[PDB]
Amino acid sequence: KSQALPFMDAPAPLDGSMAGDKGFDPLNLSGSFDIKWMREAELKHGRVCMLAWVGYVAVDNGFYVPFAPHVSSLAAHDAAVKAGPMLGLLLAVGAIEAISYNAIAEMMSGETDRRPGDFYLDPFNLCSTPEKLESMLEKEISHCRLAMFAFSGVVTQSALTGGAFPYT
Amino acid sequence: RKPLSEYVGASQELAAFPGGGGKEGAAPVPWDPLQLSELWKVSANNPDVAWLREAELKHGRMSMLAITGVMVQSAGIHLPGNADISFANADWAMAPTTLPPAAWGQVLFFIGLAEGQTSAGLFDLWLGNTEKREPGNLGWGTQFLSKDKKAADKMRLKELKNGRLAMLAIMGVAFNHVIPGALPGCMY
Amino acid sequence: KSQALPFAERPAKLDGTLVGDVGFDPLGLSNILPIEWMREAELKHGRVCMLAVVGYIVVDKGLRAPGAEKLVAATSSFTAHDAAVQSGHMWALLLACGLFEIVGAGAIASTLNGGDRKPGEFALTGGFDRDAAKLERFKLAEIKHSRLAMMAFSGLVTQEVSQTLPRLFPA
Amino acid sequence: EAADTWWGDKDYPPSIVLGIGKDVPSSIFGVTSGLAFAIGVYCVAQSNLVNILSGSTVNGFYVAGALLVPYSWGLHVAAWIQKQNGK
Ligand code: CLA
Ligand code: CLA
Ligand SMILES: CCCCCC(=O)OC\C(C=C=C1C(C)(C)C[C@H](OC(C)=O)C[C@@]1(C)O)=C/C=C/C(C)=C/C=C/C=C(C)/C=C/C=C(\C)C(=O)C[C@@]12O[C@]1(C)C[C@@H](O)CC2(C)C
Ligand SMILES: CC(=O)O[C@H]1CC(C)(C)C(=C=C/C(C)=C/C=C/C(C)=C/C=C/C=C(C)/C=C/C=C(\C)C(=O)C[C@@]23O[C@]2(C)C[C@@H](O)CC3(C)C)[C@](C)(O)C1
Numbered sequence A: 001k002s003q004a005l006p007f008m009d010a011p012a013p014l015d016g017s018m019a020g021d022k023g024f025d026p027l028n029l030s031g032s033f034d035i036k037w038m039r040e041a042e043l044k045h046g047r048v049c050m051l052a053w054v055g056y057v058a059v060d061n062g063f064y065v066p067f068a069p070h071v072s073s074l075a076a077h078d079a080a081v082k083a084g085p086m087l088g089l090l091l092a093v094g095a096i097e098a099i100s101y102n103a104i105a106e107m108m109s110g111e112t113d114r115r116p117g118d119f120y121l122d123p124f125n126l127c128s129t130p131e132k133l134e135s136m137l138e139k140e141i142s143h144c145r146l147a148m149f150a151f152s153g154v155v156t157q158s159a160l161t162g163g164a165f166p167y168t
Numbered sequence B: 001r002k003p004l005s006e007y008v009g010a011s012q013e014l015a016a017f018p019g020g021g022g023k024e025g026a027a028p029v030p031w032d033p034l035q036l037s038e039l040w041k042v043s044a045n046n047p048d049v050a051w052l053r054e055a056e057l058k059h060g061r062m063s064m065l066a067i068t069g070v071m072v073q074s075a076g077i078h079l080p081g082n083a084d085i086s087f088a089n090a091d092w093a094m095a096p097t098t099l100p101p102a103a104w105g106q107v108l109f110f111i112g113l114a115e116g117q118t119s120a121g122l123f124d125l126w127l128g129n130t131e132k133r134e135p136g137n138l139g140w141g142t143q144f145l146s147k148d149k150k151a152a153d154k155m156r157l158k159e160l161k162n163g164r165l166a167m168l169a170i171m172g173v174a175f176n177h178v179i180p181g182a183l184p185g186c187m188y
Numbered sequence C: 001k002s003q004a005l006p007f008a009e010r011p012a013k014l015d016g017t018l019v020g021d022v023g024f025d026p027l028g029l030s031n032i033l034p035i036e037w038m039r040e041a042e043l044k045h046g047r048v049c050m051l052a053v054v055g056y057i058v059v060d061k062g063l064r065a066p067g068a069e070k071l072v073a074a075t076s077s078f079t080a081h082d083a084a085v086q087s088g089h090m091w092a093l094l095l096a097c098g099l100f101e102i103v104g105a106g107a108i109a110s111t112l113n114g115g116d117r118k119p120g121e122f123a124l125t126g127g128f129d130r131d132a133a134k135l136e137r138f139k140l141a142e143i144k145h146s147r148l149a150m151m152a153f154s155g156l157v158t159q160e161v162s163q164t165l166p167r168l169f170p171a
Numbered sequence D: 001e002a003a004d005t006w007w008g009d010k011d012y013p014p015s016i017v018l019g020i021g022k023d024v025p026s027s028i029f030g031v032t033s034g035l036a037f038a039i040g041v042y043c044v045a046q047s048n049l050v051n052i053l054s055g056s057t058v059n060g061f062y063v064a065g066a067l068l069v070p071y072s073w074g075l076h077v078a079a080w081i082q083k084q085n086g087k
């Protein structure tokens, strides 16, 4: 009954209802550990990869903010660590991830019905009807899976070559 | 429990005197002067005769293998030597020293894996609760021996005797490399 | 009772559920691990050796990949491995083989022991599925060619290293 | 409160003694035990095959990999627990 691997059936019954389900889990990690943590990690990785690909492209083009010495995105990490504001960005991320500590701890063990990677940062009601919510969830998770490979390729090509915008 | 009388391993040459004999086993009870197989009756700390049989079978098998290795390494017959590895130390007890960690570390590793994975039911021994295990019955050569009772017991008695001799011998080649003279005709 | 050894019993667990079972197990090695793992190992080894034989006898007679350049790999398949390790292409091949091995091998060996499918299907039929007589005939042909090319690749490599390959595609 | 974790009347502990890894099958536990043991022994061997120096040769990856040796003990114990439990 598996979809991606048609010689199997359902790598544990954990893969039955969530968005982006294609029965693809050959190493049975969906049934070995609770799948809510896996979906939280997947969505979180994909969102990080999306913003990381957007930032890596924009810094490599010329969008540079005030001050911020104009260097390529490969050396921008070291340049801004020696500059200083990378530590402040790390502090802000750490505060958000302390709130994420609270969110994930409430989500896994009862007493909160939060979806993995949910939050409630939905100002414009683009997921009011359940069908719209399902469609946006499918688009979000597909964008996650695409942007992981996209940013991985961008970083690898930028590191091995000298560096350009299309990365050869 | 199994009270040591049905265990094959009694020897004719400890009944060599007029009175007592057979194919190769003594008739009136196997040899146990210190009554070490009766030590389970007082306290459960002492092992059962099943654990003792498993221990001596393991010791005998390792000792046959060890004395054969001693007899072959001591003069010639070494594996072909390539790059970064020479099997040239003909002197026993020092051969693992002149050996790379990929070789001496691989013998111990596979010995440990085979020992741990064949250790299913050794602690169902020490208490006489055989059911499974059946002392040394690892499966390597089960159904290969004869399906009757006399021939199988004869084969097992052959295994135990050769094994005991090998134990005494590998401990005669040892304790002679340690202190000079524990075996008059030594050759090693 | 056996067929390949018609003088010494018949090996246990070799009843004939798998194809090409003539009862050739003189050492009785069908008891250490389950027979599904052994059949999977035999089939995987045979597929690897058939692809290896084809690749060796095609590269050795002379054929280069798209933009395969000019290195000691292009001289012969003898030094092709040591050439491509240094160029790092063997790391890419190991990555691709590792990805497919994770997915295929983990799924395929995890579920036979649980119980779920024939030993070595992969469901990539590529055509012939309806003619089950041809399916079992192709299973027999696959395992026979598997054993034949395991022997063939062993012979090829040992012949070539025994003379250090003086440019002999018959070897 | 907590869970009934006592197993003095059984020959093996229940699966709930593993906490967050109470559903991992025994084969994954054993394979990861062997892998963690091999990697950890390699990492600690990189401290005696090569003399660890005052700052020059410390190699924190080998330090983090050195924690896999006590982790490999817990994985092969959990492999036995899941095997007796049938998982
Ligand atoms: C056992 C199989 C096997 C192995 C180990 C090799 C190994 C090698 N071959 Mg080779 N080859 C094979 C089979 C094999 N071949 C077969 C069957 C053919 C068809 C006739 C060829 C045709 C061939 C040519 C024409 C050339 C080589 C070359 C090479 C060398 C470098 C290859 C390279 O850069 O790849 C690393 C780079 C990669 C991109 C990896 C390849 C990824 C493919 C897709 C394999 C991945 C798995 C694949 C999908 C199979 C899974 C099947 C599964 C779905 C059931 C290397 C020594 C080249 C060379 O230098 O020789 C002088 C060369 O010119 N081979
Ligand atoms: C690893 C050693 C070992 C062990 C565990 C056994 C175990 C056994 N033997 Mg056995 N045996 C051994 C070595 C061993 N044997 C050797 C080397 C010989 C040749 C001399 C024999 C000759 C022999 C005969 C002829 C018979 C047995 C029998 C038995 C069984 C009952 C006797 C008993 O309880 O012994 C328990 C033994 C031990 C607990 C071993 C420990 C030894 C002591 C306590 C410590 C070491 C002292 C020792 C003197 C060491 C000094 C140096 C030494 C190398 C000489 C039992 C299964 C009988 C049998 O088959 O019953 C069915 C029987 O008739 N054995
Ligand atoms: C890829 C490898 C393949 C082989 C290995 C392997 O997989 O076997 C696995 C196996 C058996 C098995 C198998 C099954 C699982 C049963 C079934 C498998 O089949 C399947 C898939 O079902 C087959 C098989 C045979 O494999 C058994 C595994 C046994 C294992 C893994 C035993 C570890 C002890 C660790 C100890 C004692 C640690 C001491 C640690 C110490 C003393 C320290 O920590 C000291 C310390 O200083 C350190 C070092 C660092 C410091 O920071 C901390 C301090 C200072 C304290
Ligand atoms: C110096 C030396 O000696 O070594 C050299 C050797 C050598 C070999 C020359 C070198 C090289 C090159 C290497 C290693 C190249 C590796 C390249 C690699 C491995 C590149 C991955 C791409 C991933 C893709 C395309 C993913 C697509 C994903 C696609 C197309 C999807 O649709 C994903 C999907 O999710 C969506 C979007 C929606 C989902 O609903 C459905 C799915 C899941 C299907 C190096 C680096 O120079 C090193």
Ligand SMILES: CC1=C(C#C/C(C)=C/C=C/C(C)=C/C=C/C=C(C)/C=C/C=C(C)/C=C/[C@@]23O[C@]2(C)C[C@@H](O)CC3(C)C)C(C)(C)C[C@H](O)C1
Pocket (backbone or CB within 6 Å): B031, B032, B033, B034, B035, B036, B059, B060, B062, B063, B065, B066, B067, B069, B070, B073, B092, B093, B094, B095, B096, B167, B168, B170, B171
């Ligand atoms: C590593 C290595 C090698 C090796 C090796 C290995 C693994 C060697 C192993 C050797 C091994 C395992 C040797 C066991 C001996 C046990 C004995 C002798 C037991 C005696 C026990 C006796 C004599 C007990 C007798 C009694 O109990 C009886 C029977 C009844 C009781 O009432 C009365 C008493 C107590 C008296 C090579 C191959 C050698 C060289 C190579 O290069 C490197």
Ligand SMILES: CC1=C(C#C/C(C)=C/C=C/C(C)=C/C=C/C=C(C)/C=C/C=C(C)/C=C/[C@@]23O[C@]2(C)C[C@@H](O)CC3(C)C)C(C)(C)C[C@H](O)C1
Pocket (backbone or CB within 6 Å): C050, C051, C053, C054, C124, C125, C126, C127, C145, C148, C149, C151, C152, C153, C155, C156, C159, C169, C170, C171
């Ligand atoms: C399943 C599938 C497909 C498929 C497939 C595949 C890949 C089928 C492949 C079959 C394959 C590739 C089978 C090879 C056998 C090799 C043999 C028998 C080697 C013999 C070699 C022998 C007998 C001897 C060799 C010698 O070297 C020796 C011993 C000494 C030398 O001196 C002399 C020579 C050199 C002669 C489709 C249909 C393509 C697509 C579909 O979607 C999915």
